Amino acid sequence: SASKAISDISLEVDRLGGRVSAFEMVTKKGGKIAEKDLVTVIELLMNELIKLDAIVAEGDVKLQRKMQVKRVQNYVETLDALKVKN
Ligand SMILES: [Cl-]
């Protein structure tokens, strides 16, 4: 069930996105993020990217898969930018 299996990865991406948001706030408020934590989250996101680089769908479901892929790419992009700065 494509649509379902993606909405599932989507739930994990929601949670990982929350961690990204937490890292951003810490940084915004003058705090420091452990490099170890940045790598942990980036790598959990890459695992979701791998899971989504294998879900076959058609029609609007294919669009949902690409949207989740875009979400992950954006978060990794945000995390890479933070790592430079942490
Ligand atoms: Cl697809």
Swiss-Prot record:
Entry keyword set: Chaperone, Phosphoprotein
Assigned GO CC terms: cytosol; mitochondrion; nucleus
Signal peptide positions on this chain: none
BAG domain mapped to chain residues: 5-83
GO biological process, any: cytoplasm protein quality control by the ubiquitin-proteasome system
GO MF term set: protein-folding chaperone binding
Record function comment: Co-chaperone that regulates diverse cellular pathways, such as programmed cell death and stress responses.
Subunit structure: Binds to the ATPase domain of HSP70/HSC70 chaperones.
Protein name: BAG family molecular chaperone regulator 1
The organism's taxonomic lineage, starting at the top: Eukaryota, Viridiplantae, Streptophyta, Embryophyta, Tracheophyta
UniProt gene name: BAG1
Range of the intact protein held here: 157 to 241 of 342
